[PDB]
Amino acid sequence: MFTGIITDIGKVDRVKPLNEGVLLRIETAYDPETIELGASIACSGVCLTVVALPEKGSNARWFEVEAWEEALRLTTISSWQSGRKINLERSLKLGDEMGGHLVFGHVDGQAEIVERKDEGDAVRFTLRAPEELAPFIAQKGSVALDGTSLTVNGVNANEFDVLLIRHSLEVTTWGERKAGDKVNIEIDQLARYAARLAQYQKL
Amino acid sequence: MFTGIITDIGKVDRVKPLNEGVLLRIETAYDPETIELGASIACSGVCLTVVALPEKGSNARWFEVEAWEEALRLTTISSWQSGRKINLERSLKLGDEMGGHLVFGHVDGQAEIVERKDEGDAVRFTLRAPEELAPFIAQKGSVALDGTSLTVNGVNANEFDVLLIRHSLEVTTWGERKAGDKVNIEIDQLARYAARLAQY
Amino acid sequence: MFTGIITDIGKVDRVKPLNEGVLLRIETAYDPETIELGASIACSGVCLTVVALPEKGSNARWFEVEAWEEALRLTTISSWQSGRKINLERSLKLGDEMGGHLVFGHVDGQAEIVERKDEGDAVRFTLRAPEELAPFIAQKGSVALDGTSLTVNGVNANEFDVLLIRHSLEVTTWGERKAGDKVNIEIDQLARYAARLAQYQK
Numbered sequence A: 001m002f003t004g005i006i007t008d009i010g011k012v013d014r015v016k017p018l019n020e021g022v023l024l025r026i027e028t029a030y031d032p033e034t035i036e037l038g039a040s041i042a043c044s045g046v047c048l049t050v051v052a053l054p055e056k057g058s059n060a061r062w063f064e065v066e067a068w069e070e071a072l073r074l075t076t077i078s079s080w081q082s083g084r085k086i087n088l089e090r091s092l093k094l095g096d097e098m099g100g101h102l103v104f105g106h107v108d109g110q111a112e113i114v115e116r117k118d119e120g121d122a123v124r125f126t127l128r129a130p131e132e133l134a135p136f137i138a139q140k141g142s143v144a145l146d147g148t149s150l151t152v153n154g155v156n157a158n159e160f161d162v163l164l165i166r167h168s169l170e171v172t173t174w175g176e177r178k179a180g181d182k183v184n185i186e187i188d189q190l191a192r193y194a195a196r197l198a199q200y201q202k203l
Numbered sequence B: 001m002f003t004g005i006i007t008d009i010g011k012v013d014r015v016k017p018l019n020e021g022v023l024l025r026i027e028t029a030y031d032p033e034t035i036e037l038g039a040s041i042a043c044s045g046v047c048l049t050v051v052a053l054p055e056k057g058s059n060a061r062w063f064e065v066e067a068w069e070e071a072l073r074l075t076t077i078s079s080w081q082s083g084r085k086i087n088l089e090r091s092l093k094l095g096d097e098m099g100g101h102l103v104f105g106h107v108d109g110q111a112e113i114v115e116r117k118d119e120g121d122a123v124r125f126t127l128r129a130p131e132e133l134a135p136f137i138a139q140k141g142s143v144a145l146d147g148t149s150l151t152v153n154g155v156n157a158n159e160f161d162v163l164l165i166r167h168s169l170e171v172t173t174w175g176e177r178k179a180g181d182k183v184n185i186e187i188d189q190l191a192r193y194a195a196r197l198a199q200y
Numbered sequence C: 001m002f003t004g005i006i007t008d009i010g011k012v013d014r015v016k017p018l019n020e021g022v023l024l025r026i027e028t029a030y031d032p033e034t035i036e037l038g039a040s041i042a043c044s045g046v047c048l049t050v051v052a053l054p055e056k057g058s059n060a061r062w063f064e065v066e067a068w069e070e071a072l073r074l075t076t077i078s079s080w081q082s083g084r085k086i087n088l089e090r091s092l093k094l095g096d097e098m099g100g101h102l103v104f105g106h107v108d109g110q111a112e113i114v115e116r117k118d119e120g121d122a123v124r125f126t127l128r129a130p131e132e133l134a135p136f137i138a139q140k141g142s143v144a145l146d147g148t149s150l151t152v153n154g155v156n157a158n159e160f161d162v163l164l165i166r167h168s169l170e171v172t173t174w175g176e177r178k179a180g181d182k183v184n185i186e187i188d189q190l191a192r193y194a195a196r197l198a199q200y201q202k
Ligand SMILES: Cc1cc2nc3c(=O)[nH]c(=O)nc-3n(C[C@H](O)[C@H](O)[C@H](O)CO)c2cc1C
Pocket: A099, A100, A140, A149, A150, A151, A165, A167, B040, B045, B046, B047, B048, B049, B050, B065, B066, B067, B068, B069, B070, B071, B072, B074, B075, B104, B105, B106, B107, B108
């Protein structure tokens, strides 16, 4: 489980294609001693498993994950090249504060940024979700974009607004995010329980 | 996310103006040592991000958050001045229970208290919410008013009642809350997903 | 509490009737020196208290738990016989990593397996859920079945699908599980929250 609070910005060192997927090495600020093989780290909102870590005793700070078929088709990862900075988040450990909402790291699809507007030291992004995701995005509800849990500030059909506070613009990749950029989108899982109940009551 | 149960009354120390925003220093009973930079704290129902804490070796207990367009546009933070007592609540920890009402800190706007009647050891508050929020106010449904999970009692269009017990009046800012005041309103997160799903 | 990642398959050594409950002795691969008295162990999704251990200097490697009327009514324990293999998990201490989802070990009812279709090294399980639980079993949501953390891949009426990977079948009792079997179900926090708010409509 995650919460959508980014704790580090990582850089992609290597991109190596494999069967069904790709292999990624990500330079990080995390201490690799605190990471075990087969742990989950959300990379730009995508739950990925650690497969390789630095030789123990080493000081180098990176980890390796594999992306697969479902990941490459749905997510932004297929466009990821060396030098790309991404949002990172470690899994919630028992007792950790759940700052945003319940983010699972399972990306539904991709949303395009159509407008970027400055709001002083804050920035307001406007995005188009794919039609199939629109019903699950509500005003003053939650969403997970690039692994960042955000408040939906206004919605018109499949288009919606988010405001990115100054702190987040500093500690996340959203500072370099510009109009025309495609981000990973994870709708609030709490919405699927609203759909389920309604669909169950229609039978 | 939060449970909507207030665990301290903070006090606004300073309001320093920013570029389309304001910096807030909030005096609290919380131990700063237990607050991580970037943490979320529900300040009177508004979920804000901690950006600064006191220096090491300082014997003060405060935190700093920044409020921007949406927070100022919609919440009571627009009127916040030094000396103002506010409700505080920490984020919910993984392993704790989500008993009855989840508060996410996404406030829709301001409700206005229009009447304050005493009822024994308790006080009944009659409130009036913005037009758009009337359909969400369903009798006996939960709502977050100044970050306090309260059951909506009697309801007349956009008018509704909440009942606050003696203990609630002592540990929250509701005890000092008088007729005419503005409170933050957060509608149930699950209810808003339902109505959005309904408009299809 | 627990995560739904099963660390051992245990075998029920013997079933002893108590005055209003049952005493169970469970054989385990867990190191006897690590199991304290009064500890919590999730037995096929049911959080039970360790009540008895072997004597001082004993070689035996078992522990004992006691199940009560609440568990015997709700859980699969009432049918557990000697030699039954059950899923085991140790309790999480504060600060522990969590590779599944939050599991309290408090089951809500029993789910009935209705299908077992192979998908190569993965196996798809279709299950029938109680009426009270069915409206709060959502697609892509989390669930605990026999104490194992699983994701609901498809939901239709009172029947839902979960997928089990080759490793999960090798290390949990799902490798022996088949059509007709009753399993222990605990819905996750969000499902419980939605359920808490639906039952509140009275
Ligand atoms: C985890 C989280 C942190 C937030 N932090 C801030 C913040 O630091 N400043 C701010 O103006 N708004 C913030 N918001 C949005 C704010 O709560 C919202 O605009 C108001 O509650 C009005 O709905 C945050 C929202 C979430 C979900």
